[PDB]
Amino acid sequence: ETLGEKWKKKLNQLSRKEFDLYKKSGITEVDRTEAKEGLKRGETTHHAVSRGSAKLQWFVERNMVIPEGRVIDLGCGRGGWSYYCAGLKKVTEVRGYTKGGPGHEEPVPMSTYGWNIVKLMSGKDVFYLPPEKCDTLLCDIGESSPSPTVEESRTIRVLKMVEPWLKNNQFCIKVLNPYMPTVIEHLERLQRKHGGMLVRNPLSRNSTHEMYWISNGTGNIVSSVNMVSRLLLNRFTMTHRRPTIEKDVDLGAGTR
Numbered sequence: 001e002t003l004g005e006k007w008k009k010k011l012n013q014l015s016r017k018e019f020d021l022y023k024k025s026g027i028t029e030v031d032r033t034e035a036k037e038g039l040k041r042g043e044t045t046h047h048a049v050s051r052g053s054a055k056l057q058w059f060v061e062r063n064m065v066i067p068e069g070r071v072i073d074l075g076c077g078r079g080g081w082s083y084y085c086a087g088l089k090k091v092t093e094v095r096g097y098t099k100g101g102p103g104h105e106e107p108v109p110m111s112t113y114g115w116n117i118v119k120l121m122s123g124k125d126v127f128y129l130p131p132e133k134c135d136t137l138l139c140d141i142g143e144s145s146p147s148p149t150v151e152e153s154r155t156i157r158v159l160k161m162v163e164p165w166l167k168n169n170q171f172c173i174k175v176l177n178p179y180m181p182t183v184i185e186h187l188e189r190l191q192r193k194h195g196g197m198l199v200r201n202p203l204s205r206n207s208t209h210e211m212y213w214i215s216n217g218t219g220n221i222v223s224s225v226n227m228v229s230r231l232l233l234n235r236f237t238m239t240h241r242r243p244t245i246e247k248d249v250d251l252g253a254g255t256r
């Protein structure tokens with residue numbers, strides 16, 4: 001039994017009150033107050049549509065993924081990763097795909113900096129899309145489940161779906177459940193072929209063990225995964241630590 005599976009069993013036993021106190025304990029988060037108020041008013045400039053823009057920003061500012069050329073954003077939801085990439089000088093086109101419909105986020109139209117190079121398309125299930133030529137492949141798909149075997153299936157499905165899109169390109173891919181042994185086996189195979197490394201984002205909630213496979217890095221996947229399991233298990237042992245609260249991103253305005 002992995003450290004991650006022990007964390008999962010403990011998470012599943014939490015009452016709603018305990019879960020609500022645990023999920024943000026000691027994490028980092030952006031203050032969404034101003035963006036939520038502006039989005040409620042129908043403002044289309046400056047605001048990030050979701051917490052996703054700051055989340056991807058964290059990796060990009062650390063050179064973990066360096067978006068460039070034609071960017072594909074799989075599972076774009078409202079479009080946070082797409083609108084953030086649209087403002088980056090090396091980026092020339094952003095194509096976002098998302099499922100939409102009941103239970104799923106629809107793309108939000110915005111006029112943030114670089115909006116003219118963005119096309120967000122809903123009604124697109126990526127498990128039925130043929131791969132396209134691109135210079136950057138982003139993917140933020142992985143639905144949490146109380147069942148780690150359901151999450152293992154969903155993670156493996158994402159890893160097999162993204163591979164044909166990977167052609168010596170920059171990438172940032174969510175790995176919903178990176179601790180299940182079958183997932184580690186696929187990740188090690190993928191890293192041997194395409195390189196990169198698995199990284200824990202400090203903006204991720206403690207309620208998910210997600211890590212992101214990024215193109216610009218090296219390291220031992222197993223070691224990185226167990227470090228997150230230990231961190232997340234340690235966060236059950238202490239009173240809630242209020243999160244580090246940072247300013248949200250300003251995505252500006254205008255065409256590129």
Ligand SMILES: C[S@@+](CC[C@H](N)C(=O)[O-])C[C@H]1O[C@@H](n2cnc3c(N)ncnc32)[C@H](O)[C@@H]1O
Binds near residue numbers: 050052053074080127
């Ligand atoms: C974690 S959210 C992405 C948030 C986004 N990165 C942002 O910055 O706003 C993942 C999205 O993937 C979508 N999704 C889930 N399964 C999908 C699939 N089979 N095909 C396409 N989109 C999918 C969900 O509806 C959801 O909006």
Ligand SMILES: Nc1csc2nccnc12
Binds near residue numbers: 011012013145146
């Ligand atoms: N998704 C959930 C809603 S309540 C709950 N409690 C334990 C595990 N998962 C859940």
Ligand SMILES: Nc1csc2nccnc12
Binds near residue numbers: 011207
């Ligand atoms: N109470 C909970 C324990 S685990 C979980 N996952 C999602 C929503 N609620 C819960």
Ligand code: NA
Binds near residue numbers: 103105
């Ligand atoms: Na929804």
